[PDB]
Structure formats: structure tokens, C-alpha cells
Design a binder for this molecule. Sequence first.
Ligand SMILES: NC(=O)C1=CN([C@@H]2O[C@H](COP(=O)(O)OP(=O)(O)OC[C@H]3O[C@@H](n4cnc5c(N)ncnc54)[C@H](OP(=O)(O)O)[C@@H]3O)[C@@H](O)[C@H]2O)C=CC1
Ligand code: SF4
Ligand code: SF4
Ligand code: SF4
Ligand code: SF4
Ligand code: FES
Lengths: 115, 101, 121, 100, 164, 688
Amino acid sequence: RGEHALRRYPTGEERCIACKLCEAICPAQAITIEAEEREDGSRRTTRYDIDMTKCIYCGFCQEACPVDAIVEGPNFEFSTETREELLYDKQKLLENGDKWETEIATNLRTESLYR
Amino acid sequence: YSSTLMTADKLGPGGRSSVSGITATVFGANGFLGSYIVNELAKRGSQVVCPFRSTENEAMHLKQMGDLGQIVLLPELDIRNDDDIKRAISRSNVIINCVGM
Amino acid sequence: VVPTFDWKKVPVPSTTAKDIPVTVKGATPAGDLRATSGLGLGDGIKNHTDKWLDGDKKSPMEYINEVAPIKVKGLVVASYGSDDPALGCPVEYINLKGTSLENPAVCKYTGNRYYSDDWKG
Amino acid sequence: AWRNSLSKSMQELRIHLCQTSAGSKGVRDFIVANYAEMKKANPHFPILIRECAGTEASLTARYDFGAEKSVNVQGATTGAVQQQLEQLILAGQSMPKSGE
Amino acid sequence: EFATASADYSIAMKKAAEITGAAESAMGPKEGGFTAGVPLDTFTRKARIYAPARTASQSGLARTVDFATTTPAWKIEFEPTAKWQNPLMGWTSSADPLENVGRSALVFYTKEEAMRFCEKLGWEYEVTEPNKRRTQRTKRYMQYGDNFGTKRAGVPDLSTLPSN
Amino acid sequence: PPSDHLEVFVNEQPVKIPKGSSVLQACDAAGIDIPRFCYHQRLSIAGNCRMCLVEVEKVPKPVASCAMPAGPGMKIKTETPMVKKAREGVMEFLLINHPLDCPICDQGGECDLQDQAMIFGSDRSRFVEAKRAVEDKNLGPLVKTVMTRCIQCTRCVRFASEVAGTAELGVTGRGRDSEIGTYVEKLMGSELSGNVVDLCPVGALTSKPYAFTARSWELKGTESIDVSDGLGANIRVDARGTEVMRILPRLNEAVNEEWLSDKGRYQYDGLKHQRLDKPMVKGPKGLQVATWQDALGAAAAALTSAAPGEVRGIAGKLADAESMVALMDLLRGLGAGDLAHEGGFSDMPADVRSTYTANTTVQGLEQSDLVLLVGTNPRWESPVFNARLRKMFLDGTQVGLVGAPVDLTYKYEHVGSDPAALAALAAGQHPFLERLKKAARPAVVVGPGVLRRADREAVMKAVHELCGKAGVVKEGWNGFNVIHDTASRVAALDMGFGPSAAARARRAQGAQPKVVYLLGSDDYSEEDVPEGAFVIYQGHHGDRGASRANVVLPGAAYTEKSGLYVNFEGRVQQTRAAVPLVGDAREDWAILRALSEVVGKRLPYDSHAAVRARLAGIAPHFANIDAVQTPVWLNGEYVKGVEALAKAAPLQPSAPLTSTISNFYMTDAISRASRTMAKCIQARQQTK
Ligand SMILES: NC(=O)C1=CN([C@@H]2O[C@H](COP(=O)(O)OP(=O)(O)OC[C@H]3O[C@@H](n4cnc5c(N)ncnc54)[C@H](OP(=O)(O)O)[C@@H]3O)[C@@H](O)[C@H]2O)C=CC1
Ligand code: SF4
Ligand code: SF4
Ligand code: SF4
Ligand code: SF4
Ligand code: FES
């Protein structure tokens, strides 16, 4: 359970559908979500924040997600010099997922036999 | 302009998490008087921009003085360069000069 | 008796009428009411994607619009979003009758589009 | 006649009563026997009859500049509340005037 | 016979509330706030004692005053104070210490229990009695057999029959 | 009575119930809450979901408790093995074709199907076949359909037939392919069309403006009142921080039962646009932001430099009683008397409360067997009140109307259209008078469009003569009712917010004010606000009244304050703050108390309780919240008292008795700023 990340389908569409289950289960209340409907009618988020200085790195959000959108990736080396660099918004989490997608998929090909 | 500076954007009762509406640039903020002025502005919920010439170790005490995002630190200030002065005041409605010798 | 009401003579303020959030074709009729919340109103942002994406970066909506609809034989299709059903979405059963390449049916989980030439047409 | 005088001394008259209480009987009799004649003399004078369950019978005169006086009339007869309205009329002459 | 939720630990909670000597504890007005040790300006605020109505979205009645003896349903609520947005992230900020304490933690079986708590703590209170549900249906569609009655269009006239 | 309450046994407990009650009502009187999907209290019984199945002794099958009547000495069992097996089986049948849609569904968190599956159902499924897939339907801009989630309870069909009256939905097809909707593409045109979203127990019908924005567990709910009309429907406001997310009705059988019109439900998005959040003073550059001290000083300077006869104060449609009594006392303390109301008939006499309120009350009107409407359109003035009128129609109450013919969703007899027809009815020329004379409890409802007329006194005299001849008001029954369409009018009539005789004379000879105070007024006439006058606007939306003002003082909306409002039956109700004040706005009575201090004559009250006590000192019924007095009836003495107003401004027997509401979806500044109301109008314009 490392740095949180947001994932896509192979087409390039976001997996997240703003169900707010990960926000409800979070014991630290480290997630803040706002949503409305997109211009094509889809149900998508407009804000998805994770306070990494409030997070406890439990993985409960990863368990609660029904579409495998939020994960905790294999990155542990993400120390910064300012605390404002650790208040992640939606764009940075998507950038993390776009960085770590192949490793996350390799990990999930094994861990889907157990979960 | 008159008293719209202190009233128009004032949000919250006035603590560390509140908003006063002041964006200020303090020149010579790491000095003796400038540090107290920066503490006085930031504790009421104002954004304070602090350019400095010295090393970061001598300016680290200004980082504590305000909430997240409200203390802005700009190292390698050269006051013979107008670009640094232009960047440091580009969002401020208050400028305070404590530079002396 | 009971005269008809003329709705076309009802005045609407021009500031309100020009600011109605509507939809492109997608999963609705084009031009129906789009639900919005208050986020972004202080910054003057009326668009969904601009509220969280900054720059000329390729949006997710522009990614899914480049994938063509998929021809499926039958009347109902099951959508998982993956080859492996454990790795995708909960299964969505999408109606395919009355659908064509021009007016396909869209998955509410994935945004993939499907149509069938099996409903006597 | 006191009824014609009841547009110059005061700006408004407010009557408070209970609908069923024994103490508001004389006030109700006064209103029933005198509202039409007090309104016929001046058709534009506001006479606010207001009722609530279990309240105290009271008369209130509003003068100019927002001034107000009150007299408690609970347990009074029709002649008695007539009298109290008449001293409400009398105090209206010694009030400052407005409008001009 | 007596059976009013007679199969759970709530039997052992109704008694232990009526133990002698402890069932008659009483304090003077505002006295419990003096010994509470919280700042005294907190008791200058106003409180509301009320039982919240059923949500319109659902049909169940469990969180209502229908099950008042089974479940505590009366609440204490306070007026809102100022909120604003965080400049860096946009999160909702507040300075209210009583922002969620009445809605999360304080529940009472009756109206008078919540009044007693407010009186001994020093809060000034207003009490709102909930609106009573009506169970009697309309005259039309009173029973299922009134869907098919003669009240739809009257008794049928037998004047279009053959031989009239 | 021959034992009008019969005794049944529910789980061996004796229960007394009224006669004609079902098994489900007997279970409810025993403290048991039977699961249900198709039963509703306000609809007719259907009996098709099979979830309410209980066991009755000497019956080998489970009975449907919603439909089965309760007999004497009946023994009901609700916790035997066959009842639990029945509940699990019916739930399993309900879930085999349902889509796995809970993450994307808006009912998730407040779903009857989810919670009943958790409690009365099993934890597994054994179904691995393909499901039924259904295309979605278009029903307009307010109702969103995902029809794969339909469970065929037919609550929507019964609602549209019985309460809304439009009867436009049906079930097409047969068997597994049964399908709810309209066969052709149609728009749901009822004003009460948002209530069916509440009535649907699943996420088949959800609210389109609300869609995908929030979950129900995040919302802080506040019980408030509705101010979009004069009925004052009881509502619940759900907010997330500073933002109101939705508005829902709540139960009040004396006011609104369980309904709410689409304007009162969907106008909340106008609270996010054109909001006044700062004080402004007009300078040479124009209106610009100023401090509260500067704005109060400018308003006080203009209010004091003018003569007292050149000051006018106009109350808006949404002003609470505290701000209105504050403005009234402040203007009267300066020696002014020119008070006006944006809702019209400002010179109407307010001496007896029975002459401008509904004496029968809203729930007491159901005991009337014949109803005569005079010059009103109740479908556009109060659609919830019109729904209760349709409910009265469905169980036998006959309706007649004197006025312009309108669609009311029930059949009525058009007696006439003008006051000439009213006089002919009073004389005896129309046979509807004999129908009124033989009625046990006749009722007359007079709308606000009659009171807005210049000859309203003669029309009210004719109505009083008709009520005297037809026995409308007698011993034991008072059937005379006057309704309103604005939230603030009855409180202003209660407190005496009316112009003085000198001010009425000065308006008659054409005097023009120089200072105008606009207490939330944006629909003022041009005769009342002259050009070149000094305008002080106090309000919450930037509109017609704020674009013209010199001093703008930002106040609170009805979702941000707790003010008193009185509906047209005389019931004192109150709002509650669901969100805090926006920006640098203030409480509305507090602005006037501060302004009275800056002028130089302080108001004698410094708190919300003290201004409410001042209101109770003027009229004592203000102190009794959520209740209505029985008003005094003075027979024909009141009509005899105002005969001078009948002789002057004589009757106009040719002008039709009409309703003044020409735009139902946009009636005030909040609904004019709502984009949802504009889409609602555009949907009715693009259908032609
Ligand atoms: N009692 C007093 O101290 C009095 C002070 N004043 C005036 O008020 C101000 C207070 O200064 P004070 O804090 O008291 O003493 P300081 O010397 O501590 O203030 C010096 C500040 O000016 C900065 N500075 C000096 N020269 C330069 C330069 N060439 N380029 C960039 N930054 C520079 C220093 O930065 P670095 O740390 O990198 O040098 C430091 O931040 C001065 O103007 C002083 O003359 C007035 C009356 C009396
Ligand atoms: S890992 Fe734990 S703390 Fe971090 S976002 Fe998920 S639930 Fe919250
Ligand atoms: S990340 Fe997953 S659980 Fe969280 S809101 Fe998006 S879809 Fe729901
Ligand atoms: S109606 Fe919606 S929330 Fe309820 S069970 Fe079905 S999919 Fe889930
Ligand atoms: S749409 Fe809703 S109310 Fe209508 S039949 Fe289906 S489940 Fe019932
Ligand atoms: S509630 Fe009785 S069968 Fe549906």
C-alpha cells in the first residue's frame, strides 16, 4: 500500500464514476469529492482530493471501489519539501495512474485471484 | 480602496484559517522588524509574499507563521533587477518596505 | 371555453436563458438539462472538464469519443469493460434493439458504444 | 361625538381580546355594538381587531412618530371600555403631530 | 400478557434507569454547565428540541416518533455559524465547536428528557412537536374493492340493451 | 355505534382498529412496520409487489396484508417460517432482472430496495442468466429515467391518474416485457411532477437537476417552510456546507400533506446566481463596494435630508415579519406614513382577520360538499392546494367557478365569468344558487386576483350577500375563504403594514416620493418608484430593484434566516437557516436596527427574541407558532362599516374575474434566476 492513484480503461476513459464509496469508508476523512454530469451524460467527478497528510494508508478505499478506480500503487519514495505538494487533486492522481499503469496492472493480475 | 481593503474579502472571524483579503509583499521579511510584521499580517489570515536574498536557513522561521499556501517564499532576490520586484508584487494590494542598511 | 395558453409569449430573462447547462448527444437527447453543482461558479467555469483539468491536455471525454461503436450480434449485450470480469466494472446489460451505427447504445460504466443489426433492421 | 374625533387624536387603534374568555365579554360586546358606527365616521381609519386564545383584553392607541399607549380593560363593561377609549382619545390632543 | 421489545438487552436498559435513589437525581437550573467546565458563552446559544420527520425518499418509519418508546428519536440542534472556503483547496472551513455534537451524539426517548438536559446545562430551548401522520384513507379508494365499485361512473343504465 | 372499532390479534396481541382497515393497518397499529413496495397511503391499493405477505390463521396461503380487509377476531402472524420464506423469495424475484447499478444510481444510500434486501432478504443469489435490458424514456427536464431499474410497482401511474390528474403514464406490453411510460414521446406537463420522483421507491425515476451531485448521507437536513407561494408548504432543505443541494417536502396534513410544487422544489439553483454579497454605494463611477458604515451612513443621510412626506417604503413578496415590522417602525419613527406592498392591494382594510383569511382552513375544507371558486386559478396559485381540491372532487365534492375558464384537472360547472354573473347568482337567475342553498356545508373561495381589482369592495359586498343568502356562514360552519399567492402578504396585513390616510390622499393628488426603501422588492410598479428618486434596496438577489438603486444593503435569503411567515389560513410558521449568511450579508431585521441607530432614533429591540416579542405585542397570535386561531366573525357589521368604499369606486360588471399569475415558473427574483425554471419554460415553448 503506497501512493494513491487514479486509473483509466484501456480506451482512455476514467474508471471512476463518483459513487462516493471510498469517501464514505475513509476513516481519516482524507477524501473530498464533488460531481455533476458531464456534457455527454456520463457520471464523472469534478473534484477528487486526497489529503496525503491526513491519510493512514489503510487501503479501505481500494477495497470499497467497485470499478478498481482508486488504488494504492507500489510507490513509497514521494517525500517533498513543502506540505502543499502533498495535497493531491484529481489531475495529479490521474498523472500518477498514467505513470504507474503497467506495474499496477501486473500487480492486479496476481491479486485478483485472492480478492 | 478607502476601507474596502479590510472589509470586502474578509472571511472568517480572523484566526489562522480565516481570510482577511490582504495579499502583501514584504521586502526584507527575514529582518528584525519585517519578521514581526509578517507574523502580524499572516496570523489574521492574509497571504504574505516574502522575497529574500539570504540563505533559506535564515528565512525558514517565516514558513511557520501562516496556514498552508499563505506564506510564499521567493529566494535569490536581486533588488537591482526589476523582474524580481515585478514578480514579487504581481498579486499584492499591499507593499511594505523594510529594506534598510 | 378553456382557451389555450401561449407559452411563446412568456418572458424569460436573457441572462438566465443563455446560461442553461445542456448536453451533446451521448447518453441523452442532445439539448436536455445538464445537472450541475456550485463548484467553479466563483471562477466563472461553466464546463465539466475545465473544473479539474488545466491546460490543453487531452480530456478523458475526448479519449472515449475516438473509439468507434462495436457491432454485436443479438438483442442484449453484457458490458464488463475488460476481458477478465474480475478486473472491470459490474456487469451492465444494454439494450440493442433500435440501434445503429449512427445511434448506438452506450454503457453507463465505461462509455463504450454498441449496436446490433438484428432487430429486423 | 367621540367617534368623529377618533381620527385626529390617534393614527391607529388596536383592540386585543380572547374569543371565549369571561374577561373579554365587555370588549366583544363593545366591538359588536360599535364597530360599524366607528368605521362609518371615518372609512380610512385603521382599527386592528386582533384575537388570541387566553390573552388579556387591551386597547392600544398609536400616535404620530411611532408613539403608543396601552390600557388594560380585562373584566370591564361596555361602558367601561367606552370610557377607557375616551381617555385614549383625550391623551391624543397633547401629542406631537407629523405629516404636515 | 406483556411483550414490548421483550427479547433484547433494552429490557436491561429500561430498568437500571429506574433504580431507586438514582431515578430521582435532580439539579438546579444552569448548574450542570458550571461543573461541565466548558466555556460559559456556549450556553448563550439557542437550542431546538424536535423529532425529525420521515424522509420523503423512503417509506420506512424506524427513525420517527412512531417507534419513540423503542428508539430515542428526539434531538438537540443549534443554529449555524459562519462558513467559508479554504483559499488553497476549496474545503469548507468553520469556527463552530458545536457543529456536529447535537446531531451525532445527543438522542433522547422523550421531549421532557431533552428539556431536562437543556435546563440543567443552561441552554435556552424551543420545542417543536412533530406533525402526526394520518392513517385513515380517502373515501374514494378506502378499500381495494372501491377501485372497482359503482362510484367510477354510476350504476350502468340498461337502455342500450336489445329490446331496450 | 355498532362497535365501530373491531379487535384483531397481531402476534397474539389484541389491537383495536377502525372498521374497514386492512391487515397492514392492523400491523401498523400493533407497532410492526410491514415491508412494502406498491402500497402507498395517498394512492389506491394495487397489491402487485407481494412483499407485504403475512400469515392469517385458518388460511393456507399467505395473504397480501395491504389489500386484505381485517375481520373481527382475526389472528395475524408476522414472524413464522412461511412469512420469512415468502419475504426472501419475493426479494429474490425482485432482484434477478435488476441492474448492478448501485454505484451509478442516485437512490444508493436512501433506497427502499437496498434496505429491504438487507433486512428481509437473503445474502446470496443463484441467478446466472442474462438480464432484461430496457431503453430509457424522455419525460421532460425535471424527471430522469433509467428504466432498467423499474420494479413495476405502478406508483407513478396511480399518482398521475389520481393526484396530478393528467393520466399520461401507463404500462405497455405484457409479462416480463411490461414497460412503464408513454407510448409516444411526451413531456410530463404537471406542475406537481417532481413528487413522482419521491414516490418511485427505486432509481428508475430520479431528479434530473439533482443528478449525480450528492449522496444522501452527506446532506445536513433542515426543516424549513416554502416561500414560493402563499400556502407555506413544509419542506426539508439538504445542504453540503454553504451550498443547498436539494429541497424535499415533509409531512403536514393540515397544510400540504406530502406534496410540493415544481417551483418550490427546483428553484434552489437560483440561490447560486446574481447574489448580493457586499454593500454598495453609487458614486460618480456608479455602484461600487463600500463598507457597512459608509452604506448605512449614506442611507441614513438620504433618509434624513428628505422631508417625511417624500419617503416611501415597499415590502417585497418574501420579506419576513421581523424585517417588515422593523421597516414599519423605522419609517413611522421619522414621521412617514407611505407604506406599500409589492403584492398589491396596499390600501385594503385589515380590521378583522376573518375577511382576508381562509376561515374553513385547508384541512377543514374537506368537509364541504359544494365549492364555489370566485375569480381564481388554484392550479397556478397553489398546485398543492389544487391537488387537495382534486382529492375533494374524487370523493364527491362538487365544484363551481365564477371567473375565466381554466384547466383545473377536474370537472367544474362554469357559472359565469364577470361580476354581472356574480350578481345574477346572488339574485337567483342561475340554478347554482339552489345547489348552494341545499348544500349541507357550502364553501366560497376568493382568490387574490379579485382583491387586486380597483372595484374589489363592490365585488366583496356581492360575495358577502351571496354568502348570506346561501347559508355559507352559519352556526357550526364557516365556509368563507380568501386565499393568497404571496408569502409575506398576510403578515403585513396582520401587523398593520399599510399607508396612512394622508399618504393615500397624497397619492390621490399625485405627490411623488424622493426616497424609496425597497425591502426585497423587484416587481414594483413604475407609479411607486419615480425616476430620479433615491433608492435604497435591501435584498439578496441582484435584479431590477438593485440595478436602479443608489445604496445596496445585502440581506439573507429564506434558506439563510429564520423569519416568520403566515399563510392564507392564518397559521404562523417559520423558516430555519439551512446554510449560513453568504459573503458580507447580514440578517434582515438587524440591518434596519443598525440603520435606525445611524439615523438617530434607535428601535427599542436588540435581539431576535425582542423583535418577535414586539410582533407579539402588536398582534398576540404571532407568538403561537405552528397554530391557527379561530378568527372572529362580525356578520354584516364590517360590510356596513366600509360602505363608503363601496359607494366610491363603483362596480365594473364587464371586466372578467381573472387570475394575475401569468408566469407560473417565474414569480420572484429567486425563480427568475433559476436556470431550471427557464428550461421548464423552454420545454413548453419548443413543443409548438
Ligand atoms: N531600531 C531599528 O532597527 C530601526 C529600523 N528602522 C528601519 O526599518 C527597517 C528595519 O530593518 P531592521 O529589520 O530593523 O534591521 P535589518 O538589518 O534586520 O533589516 C534588514 C533587512 O533588509 C534586507 N536587506 C538589506 N540590504 C539589502 C539589499 N541590498 N538587498 C536585499 N535585501 C537587503 C536584509 O536582508 P539580509 O538579511 O539578507 O541582509 C534584511 O531582511 C530598516 O529600514 C531600518 O533602517 C527605522 C528606525 C529604527
Ligand atoms: S488508503 Fe485509507 S486513508 Fe488513504 S484514502 Fe484510502 S481509505 Fe483514506
Ligand atoms: S474512486 Fe471508485 S469508490 Fe471512489 S468515487 Fe470513484 S468509483 Fe467510487
Ligand atoms: S434502485 Fe439503484 S440504489 Fe436501489 S438497489 Fe437498484 S441500483 Fe441499487
Ligand atoms: S417507474 Fe418507479 S414508480 Fe413507476 S412502476 Fe417503475 S418502480 Fe414503480
Ligand atoms: S404492499 Fe401489498 S402487495 Fe405490495
